Design a protein around this ligand. Structure first.
Ligand code: A1AHE
Ligand code: A1AHE
Ligand code: ANP
Ligand code: ANP
Ligand code: ANP
Ligand code: ANP
Ligand code: CL
Ligand code: CL
Ligand code: MG
Ligand code: MG
Ligand code: MG
Ligand code: MG
Lengths: 259, 300, 249, 300
């Protein structure tokens, strides 16, 4: 679509116009008005993000009660399905390269003051080497006697979050944080090594205590025998004290000095 | 041995089998909804009329977003319930799938769950809990001896009673695929899970004993005897087990529950030891009109 | 915002394929395989100091290049506005924004070939670089002031620009003039015959007289002397320019 | 010196009384006859005024500039109304139309010496002497009576006609027009002085260099330097100047061009010294039918 010319130059003419491109649209149903205000403040910041490991945030069409989030469509597979395909060949180099792409995009988001809140192998898209992070800043929204927790999601949740979990509490009151984002990356780093979840599928109650008490991740780091340097990165990201978990800028160096 | 068939029980089981012999394959159109009996943790239960026969059934609906391949593995694994025939197990009519949900059509227990009875009766007296403890034990041995499967979800809401005086178990881990599909999803406000299960340690029927003990203490005092759910779970793991009030209940009952609520599953009493316990030896010789008490308490 | 087929379902609603109508800029050009190789690399660029490269369509006889439409004023018009309050801090902050964007392109192996104040957009602090990878004699005075001596020494009527020695070191030279416009709010060479500018730039005597006669700070001038270096091998990299700008008064 | 011949004064007086009949010039008042050429952002047409019967030369300069400075260009070009000389092309008027600035001037049917050289191959010495007089006389007229230099002396800006006249055009009469277009165009040959190339201070002495280099090109029929334009310019700045071949042209001509092509403008000959030079004393006394040679050479 070509529009009105805006100035003349030596290299042809430059017009205004409109472009139609393939995108991904997430629809959400909204159940106070201060919700939409906070969402607006976030999507303005998200619209300014620029990083080749972060999905391009196109914008949001707020048409009450339907909320639409528009991002660029991601070619490729999720890292979740990529690592669980037996026909995929991983190694100490491939996993480090994939990790550092994730670290670079996360480090950028935290530099822009954006906590992801749901970093997981399902929200990372792999496409012949290219690594892109999706679905950042989507747990603080407010929309449509028992909690419903998936096994996949629990493996990424830090102890401080599952300790405040209780039926009836809104999820936007859970302590999501940069440190919690690092902890989730710890699980992503585990999947890159073991091609599977860190905790056995079991009752959600048992998962909550094993994560909230720190004993689960300890048994994993003990029973599962990976490389000593690989295990160190894992224990740093999974540190019980959130204040002992490294930053992503520090994780980049830790990853870089692997075998 | 302790699964010996009483004559009135054998005829009631025989009757239920010949009643079940005439229903056939269950479809959604067969059922007309009477009332809703309750819900919780991804499941709702209706009282239902199966129109081809005249049978009033209980229909449990489990909403599950899963592939049809493992959905049929659930329906296939539930067929084992056809071989779970005991006076202490709830009868099974059939299981099918419709409109995103899995239906489990079972025997309707008009007395509901002991969780409901407790809500109306306030507390359950010791003599009545003796009859309940026998049935839970016998039912658990039946599943272990005859089907090699443990219950995994013993609690007052899954112990069903009826005006005939029967005490039957339901919602036990009969389908491995159904377990893994819905177990890690829901978490409630109360917990009856053993400390070893919470810690993720190897768990056996000894965990079901813990749940039975904790259930009896709740049904005796009329209050959950143990707030973010993690604090509750952490209490069960690191803090001492609950116990009955002192001056109220007999010593044999206190010893019975305390041997059920031993944190170490190896030192916790097993089913053969509980079968020959003083509380059971006494409660089994006792004559109790459970059918009368149940009706007069809840209004049947 | 036209909808499309649903891809999958999760806890956070449903996600569908779709298309979106977005505000973009289009540049039309009449006239090859290098374009195909370049535009694939240009579309993968992501940096908040570089304009978004949407893509390019080639319907003969026109070659359309599609980028994000930039709000704000060109750095050319910005510095040339009397109200614009520039200072040793604001000029350094603006310059460092361009350096970060130029450093990124060079890291991706992309020579800009046309860095100038008219290809930089300023918007309430936000700085974005445009028009990268686009490159009888009609030579504008504005363009000559950004051209490195090796480029003007090889300018010949009839020769295509594809033979001109564009390079990262030339890009640094063009940045030097941008830095000068940030200091003086004007071109470095007086308006004169293009022939005189060609010799003054190609011989290196032009910027030498600029640095001499002008009374710019020793630190500010050192940036200029480094960027305008006659020997292109002596010009710094943008990663090095970052630290040089950071350590200014 | 610099005073008017009787035939010249009447021809100039005739042109002025003819110029007193044009009035305000509009685009509609002109019918295009032919295109005479183009160069440096300007195309020149032979056209015909409609109010008068006058054949004019119309230069069109494309300039993307604000109308404020566009009117300043038109206002500064009005000075041409006071540039009345037999060695300066006459001026009729100037206006703006559809983004282009029009300069309507006297038509020289002989064209430029650049065009004559292309058809003549070379121009002999006795005729270049008649050209040299007019350039010097035209330059000193602009300096004496208007205090402005030419800034663009070269064969393309020396016009001739079948009457035998030799006039200068395209000089820097408008400061705003100089500043608007000079920085835009660069050709393949350069007639600019080394001091202008170096950006140093310059004067009418720079026009002397341009004349001298023009004489060398028109004598040998080839641009005497030589490629990249910078190499051409750097040769002008740092290499020795050109000179005429020895055996062909006279010594007085060789000394005339050498005194014009001295790199140091202070040591370069000025207008007054060139006016009394041996080559000028000789060429001015000579009788040469330039009107006849021009027509027979180009074909008129
Ligand atoms: C908290 N403990 S846990 O975390 O282990 N989760 C689980 N525990 C135990 C079991 C399961 C799954 C399951 C369920 C819930 C289930 C429900 C009804 C059912 O119908 C009848 N039931 C008994 C008698 C007659 C019937 F018709 C069969 C069922 O069979 C099942 O397997 C769990 F997910
Ligand atoms: C290369 N040297 S430079 O860089 O100085 N460039 C320049 N040189 C010289 C002049 C200028 C500007 C200009 C131009 C181009 C011009 C052209 C025609 C004109 O009409 C007549 N002219 C003379 C006699 C009669 C006329 F009708 C007036 C003009 O008036 C002007 O002033 C330059 F830009
Ligand atoms: N992506 C863009 N967004 C907004 N304005 C733009 C964009 N690209 C170009 N322009 C403007 O469009 C006009 C013409 O662009 P352009 O052809 O690049 O001319 P220029 O670069 O400004 N000067 P020149 O060197 O002669 O081309 C200018 O006013 C630019 O500022
Ligand atoms: N066959 C039945 N006859 C009568 N009532 C029944 C029957 N099956 C289930 N119920 C009742 O249905 C209600 C809901 O049961 P259910 O959906 O299994 O959740 P719950 O056991 O109450 N708690 P939870 O296990 O955490 O979901 C309970 O109050 C039971 O008493
Ligand atoms: N930008 C995208 N491009 C392409 N596919 C996407 C994109 N975002 C999400 N998807 C896919 O769309 C489906 C639904 O998205 P989503 O609701 O985010 O599910 P999920 O993240 O994989 N699991 P959950 O965490 O429970 O939402 C999944 O298969 C995603 O992999
Ligand atoms: N008054 C005139 N009468 C006849 N021919 C003219 C007149 N004025 C200009 N011309 C011719 O018009 C053509 C173009 O002239 P012009 O636009 O001044 O560029 P140029 O001087 O020839 N080349 P350049 O060095 O780029 O300016 C040349 O062939 C001139 O001889
Ligand atoms: Cl439970
Ligand atoms: Cl940098
Ligand atoms: Mg997602
Ligand atoms: Mg139940
Ligand atoms: Mg541009
Ligand atoms: Mg001319």
């Amino acid at each position: 679509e070509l529009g009105e010319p805006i100035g003349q130059g030596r290299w042809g003419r430059v017009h205004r116009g409109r472009w139609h491109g393939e995108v991904a649209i997430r629809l959400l149903e909204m159940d106070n008005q201060d919700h939409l205000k906070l969402f607006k403040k976030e999507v303005m910041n998200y619209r300014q993000t620029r990083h080749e490991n972060v999905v391009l945030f196109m914008g949001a069409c707020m048409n009450p009660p339907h909320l639409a989030i528009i991002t660029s469509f991601c070619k490729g597979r999720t890292l979740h399905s990529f690592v669980r395909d037996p026909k995929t060949s991983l190694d100490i180099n491939k996993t480090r390269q994939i990790a550092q792409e994730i670290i670079k995009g996360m480090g950028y988001l935290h530099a822009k003051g954006i906590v992801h809140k749901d970093l997981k192998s399902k929200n990372v898209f792999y496409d012949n080497g290219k690594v892109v992070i999706t679905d950042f800043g989507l747990f603080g929204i407010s929309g449509v006697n028992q909690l419903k927790l998936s096994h996949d999601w629990l493996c990424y949740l830090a102890p401080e979050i599952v300790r405040e979990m209780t039926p009836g509490k809104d999820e936007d009151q859970l302590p999501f944080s940069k440190a919690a984002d690092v902890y989730a990356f710890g699980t992503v780093w585990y999947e890159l090594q073991a091609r599977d979840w860190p905790l056995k599928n079991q009752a959600a109650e048992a998962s909550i205590w094993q994560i909230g008490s720190g004993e689960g991740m300890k048994r994993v780091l003990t029973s599962v025998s990976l490389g000593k340097e690989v295990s160190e990165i894992l224990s740093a990201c999974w540190a019980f004290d959130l204040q002992e978990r490294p930053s992503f800028s520090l994780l980049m160096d830790m990853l870089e000095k692997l075998p | 041995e302790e699964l010996e068939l009483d004559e009135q029980q054998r005829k009631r089981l025989e009757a239920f089998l010949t009643q079940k012999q005439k229903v056939g394959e269950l479809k959604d159109d067969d059922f007309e909804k009477i009332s809703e009996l309750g819900a919780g943790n991804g499941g709702v239960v209706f009282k239902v009329s199966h129109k081809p026969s005249g049978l009033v059934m209980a229909r449990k609906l489990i909403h599950l977003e899963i592939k049809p391949a493992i959905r049929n593995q659930i329906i296939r694994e539930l067929q084992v319930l056809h071989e779970c025939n005991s006076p202490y197990i709830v009868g099974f009519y059939g299981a099918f799938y419709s409109d995103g949900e899995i239906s489990i059509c079972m025997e309707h227990m008009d007395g509901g769950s002991l969780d409901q009875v407790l809500k109306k009766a306030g507390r359950i007296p010791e003599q009545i809990l003796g009859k309940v403890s026998i049935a839970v034990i016998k039912g658990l041995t039946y599943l272990r001896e005859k089907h090699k499967i443990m219950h995994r979800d013993v609690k007052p809401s899954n112990i069903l009673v009826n005006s005939r005086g029967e005490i039957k178990l339901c919602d036990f881990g009969v389908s491995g695929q159904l377990i893994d599909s819905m177990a890690n999803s829901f978490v409630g406000t109360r917990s009856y899970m053993s400390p070893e299960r919470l810690q993720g340690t190897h768990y056996s029927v000894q965990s079901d004993i813990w749940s039975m003990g904790l259930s009896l203490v709740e049904m005796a005092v009329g209050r959950y005897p143990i707030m973010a759910i993690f604090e509750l779970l952490d209490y069960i793991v690191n803090e001492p087990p609950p116990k009955l009030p002192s001056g109220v209940f007999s010593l044999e009952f206190q010893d019975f529950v305390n041997k059920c609520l031993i944190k170490n599953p190896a030192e916790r009493a097993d089913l053969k030891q509980l079968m020959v316990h003083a509380f059971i030896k006494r409660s089994d010789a006792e004559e109790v009109d459970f059918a009368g008490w149940l009706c007069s308490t809840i209004g049947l």
